[PDB]
Amino acid sequence: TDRVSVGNLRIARVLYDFVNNEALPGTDIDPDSFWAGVDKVVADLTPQNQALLNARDELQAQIDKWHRRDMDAYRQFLTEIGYLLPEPDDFTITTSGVDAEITTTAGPQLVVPVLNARFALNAANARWGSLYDALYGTDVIPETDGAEKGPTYNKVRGDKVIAYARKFLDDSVPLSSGSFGDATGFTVQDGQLVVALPDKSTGLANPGQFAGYTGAAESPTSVLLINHGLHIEILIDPESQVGTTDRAGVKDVILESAITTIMDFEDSVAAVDAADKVLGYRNWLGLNKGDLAARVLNRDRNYTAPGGGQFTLPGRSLMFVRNVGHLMTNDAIVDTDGSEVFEGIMDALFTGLIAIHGLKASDINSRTGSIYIVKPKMHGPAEVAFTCELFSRVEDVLGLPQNTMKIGIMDEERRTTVNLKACIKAAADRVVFINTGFLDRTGDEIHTSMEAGPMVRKGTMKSQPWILAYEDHNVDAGLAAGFSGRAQVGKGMWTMTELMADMVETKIAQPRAGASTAWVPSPTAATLHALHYHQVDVAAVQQGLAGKRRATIEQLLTIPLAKELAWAPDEIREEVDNNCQSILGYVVRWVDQGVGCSKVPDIHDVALMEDRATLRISSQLLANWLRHGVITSADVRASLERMAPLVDRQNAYRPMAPNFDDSIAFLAAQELILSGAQQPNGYTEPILHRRRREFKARAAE
Ligand SMILES: [Mg+2]
Question: 10 alpha carbon to ligand 1 midpoint, in Å?
């Protein structure tokens, strides 16, 4: 074959070559020492990795049985089987060497598929974004009569955008008197910002909110402000299209938006072989070396301090990289017998190696010397400790200081939720955040209690007792662990990519809940969500929550079982079509085109961002309804065949209809539902990877 032998490993040549020719040069790490290290790490930790997976199956088998055969009894049971462990002693995390974007700044956290270079670059550059563009291009500014979007600039709509932003400025950086709506000009005098009004001139209520400016102080090209640690930059140009119409010549209002971004190797991308992993690793490498070009990465921004000195602000989002979890293997590397090597282990080694470049001036990501890795789908403290040991072994192989590789803990599996304190403690010196990945968490909620009975509709999950308890519990544990000022307390994604007016009105609940960050689907969403952090003083919210215990173990364990006679025929029908539509729209692009993240309109025609987690939920819900007689196999088939044609319509695309059984993608969709109950913890990768590889094979012959 086309593999390279290194000890007990046989590395796909493309991966081998990529590492030696692109990743290693510049790290001082000799190839022979690196590969020997890979071999050693895989050999040493694989047994423990498998053991952990066996533990998951064992626990789930006991739970399935318990249901097939009272909160006090259930809780007692979970304790006996080691599912629910004792609460560890109180403690404070000790993670050091973390950048300000994580320890101090509260703001949006963007996620992007790392296999898409364009997206990745746009996301990295999302650190700064036009509020005008975000307001004008979305429904935040309703397209009422006269204010709708046309092929050319609508002056009326533009005026609404201007007023919207002027109000934002008034609410964020208050003037001593008057409002920005009446400003006529901006000047810097005695290191002070002076806003000219018609009747008089005024300074800032809090002069300290003035952070800088560009151009001559006597007539700045831009004025930099700061609120709750986030920058706001007013651009000034009386000659610009918008400026010519503004009272103070204001051209735009730029907001520091995506403070941090997660370059994702997991749920938003489809990488089933060495070739796919390499495309991802190379983009990750380009990001860290700063030379990725599809467009390029922006340079840092230069300003003059109010006092006179020159300073620079990062023009890029501080990058995290989300490795895959402990489950999957990938043939990018196989042993002598041909057994695939655990993908998570490889990601730690490769993304870690690559991350070293982001620790040096491009020919910088982290100035404090840390590598930020999000580790998803972990189940319990032992799996967290396993990840920490993996990182410890990789640092050794890479010759990096111990604890360089920090971990962003996803709280997205039930066994981690109910043992969250312990999970944090296991990574007390490496954790940089905990985040409530509500989608995966909901998927795990359904699978864990699969045998308990029919679950409530998917949409109903967002407001169930278990998830609300889960959200507050995550915050409580993080704050109790001393996260405020040391690590991020984050919350989930807003998947309705086009409903920005709704996101702006409701996503404010997250920072209000003490979350120093939350996930956004795009640069536009990051800029709009940034608004929330200007309205909410997260640092103050967290201080006020410190010490509070708002969720009981009972609330966390409250299974989302549906009540008797809960739905009507039309309601069950809608739920099935909606879930099938979501599954088919996502899967067809996954299997046929290798796209792990797509915008798929639901039964209500609302554009929803689909990823493996949204898929895990839809497939698990239907698997659960089919499992308990709520719907028949005919209902599932009919929905799939009814929605399939619509998906073909919405879309190098290969139609699934009319001959659905000839479509590998259609078959995958059907398999995910019908075999959903048998998938490990309801994970979609096993099926998705197999079907995607099958497609590639067929396409090759
Ligand atoms: Mg997830």
Answer: 31
616 catalytic, yes or no?
no
Span from the CA of 74 to the centroid of ligand 1 (angstroms): 26
Catalytic residue among 56, 282, 316, 322: 322
232: closest CA among 190, 262, 204, 199?
A: 204
CATH of 568-701, one of 3.50.50.60, 2.40.50.140, 1.10.3720.10, 1.20.1220.12: 1.20.1220.12
Beta-sheet pairing, 192-196 with 185-189: antiparallel
Residues within the annotated binding site for acetyl-CoA?
Answer: 111, 118-122, 268, 295, 521, 596-599, 611
CA nearest to 189, candidates 308, 288, 296: 308
* 128-258 CATH: 2.170.170.11
> In what order do the strands lie in the sheet containing 310-313?
128-130, 250-256, 230-236, 219-227, 210-216, 301-304, 310-313
CA distance 665 to 593: 10
What is the dihedral sign for C-alpha 610, 615, 621, 623? positive
What is the C-alpha separation between 541 and 532, in angstroms, rounded? Answer: 13
* DSSP code for 125: G
CATH number of 1-127+259-567: 3.20.20.360
Domain borders along the chain are 1-127+259-567, 128-258, 568-701
Residue 479 C-beta-side C-alpha neighbours within 13 Å: 23
CA 389, 395, 401, 405 torsion-angle sign: negative
Known catalytic membership, residue 252: no
Binding residues: 111, 118-122, 268, 295, 322, 412, 437-440, 521, 596-599, 611
Interatomic CA distance for residues 8 and 2, integer angstroms: 16
Span from the CA of 376 to the centroid of ligand 1 (angstroms): 6
How far does residue 613's CA lie from ligand 1's centre (Å)? 6
Q: Which residues have a Cβ under 8 Å from the Cβ of 509 and sit 6 or more positions away?
A: none
**Experimental determination technique:** X-ray
Beta bridge partners of 322: 264, 374
